[PDB]
Every structure is written in C-alpha cells, then in structure tokens.
Design a protein around this nucleic acid. Structure first.
Lengths: 83, 97, 95, 109, 95, 109, 83, 97
DNA sequence: GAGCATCCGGATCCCCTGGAGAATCCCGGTGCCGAGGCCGCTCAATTGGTCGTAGACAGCTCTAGCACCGCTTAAACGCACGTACGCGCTGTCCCCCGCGTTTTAACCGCCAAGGGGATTACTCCCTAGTCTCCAGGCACGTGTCACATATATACATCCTGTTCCAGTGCC
DNA sequence: GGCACTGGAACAGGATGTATATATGTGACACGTGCCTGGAGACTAGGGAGTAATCCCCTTGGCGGTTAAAACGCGGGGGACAGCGCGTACGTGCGTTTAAGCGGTGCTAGAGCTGTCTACGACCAATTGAGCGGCCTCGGCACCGGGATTCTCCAGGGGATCCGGATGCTC
C-alpha cells in the first residue's frame, strides 16, 4: 500500500540516457543522486500545485489539465494535453 | 582480439541516437510509483489519470534536459567535459532555483 | 451521445489545406496546435484586459490588441500579423 | 423575409471562427464591453501564426520524407527560428526532443 | 483643484502603529508599499480569476482565494494567512 | 428610521478596507460576481502580509537606529527572509541596494 | 536636436561601480563594451514596450506608470513608482 | 615612500561601501541623454518625466547588478577571480537570452 | 698514386593509411490502426432591432518639461609602476566508459471490480442592483524634530621594518 | 661536521580610512481640518450553486511470460587537477579636464479636466447551418529483414632521413 523508496526507480542508466539527450559527454558518479534530489524538488513543487487544484475542484482523482495548470504557473507550459 | 571502441565514441553515438529520437527515457512504472509515493505524502488515496502521469513525465524530462544543456554550457565554460555537482548547483542558482 | 467539447481542430485542417493540400495530421500534434492557439489567445486577451484597464477603457477594440500584439509578438511576425489583421478589419468594415 | 445567414469569418474572409472567439472573449472576462473588430483582428493574427508555423511543419515533414506531421516536426520547426524561440522560450512540446546539437569541443579531433 | 487619487497610506499607517507604536515611514517606502499591496492584490485576484475559469464557476469565493494563497504563497506564510483569513471570515460571519 | 452605518472592516476587525477591495474586485474584471467573504479574506491575507513585513522593517530600522523606515531597510527585509525572497525573487526595490554579500574566495588568505 | 553617440555616456568607472555592487573585485578591460551592448539591448526592449504603451496612451510624453507596466510585462517588476 | 595599498584591498573597500550604499551609481544627465537618444529611434519628439527616467535607471542598475553577481558565480565556478566577457554571454544564455 | 668529395644505395626510424568489423542507413515487404471523410444531430452564430452609454471631439488651463545659463567643483580620464592572475604545460592518479554476463521487473496483455466523474434535476442562499445617507480618506495647510551635514576623536587595518630561527653549502 | 649564508616566521608600529560623538538646520513626515463621494444599509429578483441520484467509465488491482533494461564486475584509457613558470593587464595612486550638477528663469506643449453627443455595442427572439459525435475504411506508417555505406581503430607499410661505401677527379 504505502511506498518508501522509488527515487531509485530513476535508475542510473536512465539518468545516463537523460544526459545523452542533454549532450553530456561524461557523467560523474556523484551526479545521479543530485539529479534525484533536483527532480524530487521539481516534481513535489508541481504536484503540491496539482493536488491543490484537485482538492479545490472537489475531486479525488488527479486530472492532466490541472497538471498543465501546475506547470504553466511556474511558466513551464507543456503543450498538447489541454482539452 | 575483440573490438573495443575508445571512450567517448559510443557516448557520442548515444548522443546522436538519443537526440534524434523522441521516445521516452524514464521507465514509466517506477516513475509512477514515485509519483504516487510523493502524492500520498500530501493527500492520501490520490488517484491518477494516465495522461496526468504522462504530462508530469514529459515536463520532468523537459526540466532535466534544460538543466543538462545549461550544465554542458557551464562545463565547457569551465574548460572541462565531465559534469560535477557544483555545476548543477550553479545552474540552479543562476536560474534562481 | 456525450455533450459537446468545442475545439480548434477543423479550422487548423482548413488553414493547412490552404497552405499544404497534401499533408496529413497526427492527433497529438493537433492537440499541440490547440494548446498553442489557446495559449496565445489567453496571452493576447490578458494584455487586452490590462491595457483596457490602464487607459480605463471599458471596450476591447482592435486598436489596443494591435498594441498588445506589438508588445508580445516580436518583430517580423508582429508587423506582418498587423498587416493581415488590418486587411481583415478593413474587409469586415466593407462587410 | 430574413436575409441569408452569412458568416463573419467569411465576412473577414478568414478560416477561424469569429463568433466563437467573440463569445469566448465575452465570457472569458476581459471586459464588459468589446468592439466588433477585435475578434476579427484576433482571428487574423492566430491564422497568420498557424499559417507560418504550419509552413515550417510542412517543410520539416517533407525534408524527413513524411506526408504526415509529427510533434518532432513541430519541435524542429519552432526551434530552428530564433524569433519563434523568443516567442516560445519557456514552452514545452510533448515528444519533441531537442535540436541535434553537439558542442564543438565535444567532437573528436 | 485636482482629482482625488486613491492610496493605502492610512491603513498601512494604522497597521504600523499596531505593530510598532514608535516607528515612522519615508514616503519612498510608502510608495514601495503601495506598489507591493497593489501587486500582491493583482497576483492573487488574477490567480483566483483563472481558478474561477477552470472550475467554470462564475462566482468567486473565499475558498478560491484560499486556494490561490496556498498555491502562490510559499511555506507557512500560506497557512498563517489561511488562519488569519479564516478568523476574519468567522468573526465577520458572526457580525 | 435607519441603522447606524457600521464599517465592514470593523466587522472583520481589520485595518484594510473591505469595501474598497470589494469594489476593486468588482471593477477588476476577475469574475462576474463576487462572494461576500472573499474580499474580507483577501484583506486579512494582505493585512497579515503587511504586518509581518512592517515588523521586519521596523526591526531592521531599529538595528540601524532609525525611527523611520527606509527603502534600504525594505531591501534588507526582503532579501534576509528566504520565504519572502521566494515570494519576491523577481521584484526590484527603488534605492534598495543589495545584501552585504562577499564570496569567500574573494577574501584574502 | 539629434543625439548620436550617447552609448559611451555610460562611462567605464560607472561600470566599475556597478561591478563593485555586483560583488566583482577584478574586472577585465574587455568587459565594458559588451556590458554597454547588454544594457543597450535591455533598454531597447523596455523603451520599445514603453513607447508602445505611450503611443496607445495617445500621449507625446512617456510616463512612469507606463514604464513600470513595461517592466512587469517583461518580468522585471519595479516597486515605488505609483504601482 | 608614499603609502599604497595592495590591489583588491581597496577594491573590497569600495565593494563594502557601494554594497552598503543605496544611491544610484551612474551619472544622471548622460542617462537622460542616452534614453532620449535611443527613444529617438522608435518615435520622434518624446518627452520624459524625470520619475520615469529614474525608474528606468533603477531597473537598469538592478538588472546589471543581477547580471554581475551571476557572472561572479560563473567566474568563481571556473576557479578564476577575474571576469571575462564569456562569463557574461554564459550568464545571459543560461538566464534565457 | 693517393686523398678527397660526392653521389648512390641501403639501414633505420618515424609517420601515414588501407582494411576489417560494425553500427547505422537505406531499400524492399507486410500488416495494421489512426485519419479522414461521410452522416446525423444540435446548439450556437447570425439577423434584426432597440436602448443605453463610452469614448471621441472640443476647449481651456496650468504645469511641468524643456531650453538657456552660470558657477563649481566631482568625476572622468589618463599614465605609470607594480603585482597579481589567466593560462598553458606536464605529470599523475584515479573514475568512469566500454563491454560482457547475469537478474529482474517492465511491460504486454488479459481479466475483475468498483470509485468517482460527471451529469441532470431541484430548490434555495446569496448577491448585483437601486436608492438614500453619511463619514472616512483625500487635499491642503502647518509645524517641527529626525536626519543630513559638519567637525573632532578614536580605533581597525594593513602593510612593512625589526627580530629570532631553521635548512644547507664549502673548507 | 660546523659556521656562515640564505630563506622563513613572528612581531610591532604608523598611516590611513572608516567608525563615532556631538552640534545644527531643514524640510519632509506627521497631524489638524473641510469635504464629498465612495462606502454602507435596506429590499428585490433572480439566478449560480450546492446537493441527491445514477452510471459507467475510467481507474485500480492482480497474474503469467519475456525480455530488454538494469546491474555488477574488469579493464583501461581519458580527463580532472595540482604545481610551476611566465608574461601580461588591470589596480591603485597622482595629476588633469571637463562636464555633470545645482540654482534660476522663461515658454510652452500637452496632460488633463469638463461638457456633448453620437456612434457603437450589449440584449434578446428565431432560426438555421456550421461544427462536433459516431462510424468505417485504407494507406501512411510501424515493424521486419537484408544489403551498402560509412565510421573507427589498428597493424602494418611506406616515406624520410642519414650515413657509409665507391669512384672519379684532382693535386
């Protein structure tokens, strides 16, 4: 039911793939846990917004459109899933 | 003697391969487990549309690749090719994160 | 049947069919277009409301949204979009 | 004896719906009063924007030998013009990827 | 004869005397305060406006304002604001 | 014949004007109709915000031995609070300056 | 009437003072003209927005509240000027 | 032998002074001359309220100060103490310009 | 006849390059499911008219923005000497990419089940609106003490002359 | 092996620059006052919104199989980095030019207030046709497969170079 460890689900090869998309030539071993922390910060910052919209909507289920609002509030607007 | 590429060669081929491609880089189910784990820390028993998960995903890789592009620029500014934690800290501080 | 969800797809089909009769459309790209037009619509409408407030004007007219387009949209698209919009509003002036 | 119902989008000679956008501004809560030429101007500018970005998407699709647009074409279209980048600096495209771009020092001798 | 211009000088002055009976202000500092309060009012009100848009509610309530405060104000500033506003709403309801 | 007029700010026990902020929302074009308690709640939120920032400004001025607040004190108040800085990272204060901040490597030895 | 070369009116010691407030202790001599260019581009953007606002105002005189509108729409909001 | 401080000690001294100080650092009259000169390019015969020019001056000063502290972060990141123009292009390009 | 010069040929050492594997591209081949178009519905744009009102225009006024001007140093500038720094080379050490092997859980896909979106109906709580009335905030005057400025002490600081001490070279 | 020579480290003191104490005016902050318009009070119409019921649909839960991704280990080459030298490039200090800055005055262009009205635009009944849900087909494209092309790394081959011998000339 409850979950305690899924930050390691963003595996080191997955972070390596992300770095290859970013054009990174060489990746230090200390990078991965930092990227886990930074990603955790961003996802919590947007998901607190998302859960705020869902509780205000009197809904129990998270909808995508609220997540779109949550990203565009920080000016990181994602296209293609509105409506 | 088995063939072995010099270091960086397969890395640059990975650069071209993953940069021409658009298909996903994060395994979706451990990510969704992480999403539900963080979500239940704030409100319990939250239910997720799959598209909500997907958007949360697209946005995360967007934010991360923005950081590694900035990291590459600051790293070649630092006369290195290997990225270090102080570089990501620098990129976040310059962005005001 | 389900209640209507109004969207901006078929207009995009018509305008693309004018500019490229041949091509096809993927649906998630079509959603990206709907997000584009809705986003730009909200930006221009917010600037229009802001300028109507600042000149204390009760009415949204073409003239201040022209001002808003010169603000938000830069340069070459700004002046050309001004050109097509002035042509259109003069044509509508001629009914 | 009413005249035939002819449309304001055709009156402006334009494809985007004048009436729907006018209604959408009226209940979009931007003013209590709105002029008639403003939705005409707005429909015109969005049609021009979609026209140019669809031109870029069509050329990107034809250069990759595709007769159907993909979001990769959209990303390649928006990012290959600097002025649209200034239009879309903070905008995320789903399944878009990034431009093929390698820093020159990363390349071997 | 000039037209009267709106300000928040007297309210901020009362609040300052409430928190600090012995302290004064400069007029530049008061200009910053007027810009501050107008700015925060604009931010919260516009955010609540788009929340009213998003749930298709044509009525704005203090629930919406609370949602906007929790959304925008970081940290315990939000919950302190919720506590103060909740107390104000209750004792306004009783009065 | 008529009850004595009693101010709504006194009903809310607040210094900020309920009626003025209510009027500002009504002419601020945010919704077609406004609930009664929403401007009260908003005025309370603003009153708490101004109360805490003025407390910080007064403490900073008392540190500077000045009985009247200065924009310099306001800049010191904003930037020395992390949470208000996260609220106001993008703002500029006239004649405020910046924090005394020297990087450690810039120091001698 | 016509002014031609006020770009070097932003003098070198003024840039040194700004670097001192910026926390720079050592400043290269090759810095000042690019900083003039960066200031130049920024001022072009803001006064272009300002003259757009003022021309909407149908006024021949630029005013302060129009300037602060231009800054907040550019995301560099100003306090203390009638906002 | 006349007195002379070693370099940087003086520099840190006006660092302390000017970072303590609140007033505008650039000369006023060339700033009105420059803003009139550049606003001449967009539209003719512009008149400037002095308050608008001061607000522009403060905004420009803060923007340059933020740029300079970002270049400070970049320069100490590259293990140097002297700034160079590529620090400024780096800081702007990470910032999004 | 002998000695030298010199040219040719082979030894040798260092630098290029072709060849083989391999990863991707490109050309067919196939089967498939999203797109596009047809059809039926419906609700929203349009037409027409009306009534109310928001802004354009005119006109006046006054005020602040610009222009001119004269001192008055503050500051810009510039040069000169100096010392600190960017940077480049080079050695060194170790960290991460490449690659292979083993584990595993991600994913497909398949099936059961119900939680909640969400949607229609109902009935009602609240709020814009109008009218009247009035009092709190604004304009404006005034005065006045907190702070800027100025000057006299006082101490930080910051750099260099002074003094004691350890490592090492030649007799 | 020791004493003299040279490089190191700790220490005191002066000069400067910034703080700091006290006198003084001054003007911007603060308070008193007329007012009027914006806020408050009361009643009405009516309508968005909260709530009950349902349903179905979309989410959640679980279970087998497979494999591709993940993970672990070995090896090594590549890259960070420390240290030393070196030449440079601002930093700082002294003198100089100037031009910003302040005080004063005049003109006025236009910002802004006030009165008119007339264009213009929300409001509403009727209506219809444009636009969206449902459906169905197919061909553009995803997947598979084989050959070409290009990239890469290396072992070797090829060129460059230098030196020794022979021989013809020459004295």
């Amino acid at each position: 039911k409850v979950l305690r460890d899924n930050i390691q689900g963003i595996t080191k090869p997955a972070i390596r793939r992300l770095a290859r998309r970013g054009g990174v030539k060489r990746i230090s071993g200390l990078i991965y846990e930092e990227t886990r922390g930074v990603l955790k910060v961003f996802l919590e910052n947007v998901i607190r917004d998302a859960v705020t919209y869902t509780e205000h909507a009197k809904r129990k289920t998270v909808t995508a459109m609220d997540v779109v609002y949550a990203l565009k509030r920080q000016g990181r607007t994602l296209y293609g899933f509105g409506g | 003697k088995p063939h072995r590429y010099r270091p960086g060669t397969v890395a640059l081929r990975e650069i071209r391969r993953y940069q021409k491609s658009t298909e996903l880089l994060i395994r979706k189910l451990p990510f969704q487990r992480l999403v539900r784990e963080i979500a239940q820390d704030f409100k319990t028993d939250l239910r997720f549309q799959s598209s909500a998960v997907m958007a949360l995903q697209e946005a995360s890789e967007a934010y991360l690749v923005g950081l590694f592009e900035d990291t590459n620029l600051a790293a070649i500014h630092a006369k290195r090719v290997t990225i270090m934690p102080k570089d990501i800290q620098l990129a976040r501080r310059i962005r005001g994160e | 049947k389900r209640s209507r969800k109004e969207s901006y797809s078929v207009y995009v089909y018509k305008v693309l069919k004018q500019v490229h009769p041949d091509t096809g459309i993927s649906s998630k790209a079509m959603g990206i277009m709907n997000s584009f037009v809705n986003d730009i619509f909200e930006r221009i409408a917010g600037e229009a409301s802001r300028l109507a407030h600042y000149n204390k004007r009760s009415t949204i007219t073409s003239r201040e949204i022209q001002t808003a387009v010169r603000l938000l949209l830069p340069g070459e698209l700004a002046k050309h979009a001004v050109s097509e919009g002035t042509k259109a509003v003069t044509k509508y002036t001629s009914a | 004896a009413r005249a035939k119902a002819k449309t304001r989008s055709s009156r402006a000679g334009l494809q985007f719906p004048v009436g729907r956008v006018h209604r959408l501004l009226r209940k979009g809560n931007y003013s209590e009063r709105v002029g008639a030429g403003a939705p005409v101007y707005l429909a015109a500018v969005l049609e021009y924007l979609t026209a140019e970005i669809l031109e870029l998407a069509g050329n990107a699709a034809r250069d990759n030998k595709k007769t159907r647009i993909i979001p990769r074409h959209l990303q390649l279209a928006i990012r290959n013009d600097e002025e649209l980048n200034k239009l879309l600096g903070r905008v995320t495209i789903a399944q878009g990827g990034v431009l093929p771009n390698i820093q020159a020092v990363l390349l071997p001798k």
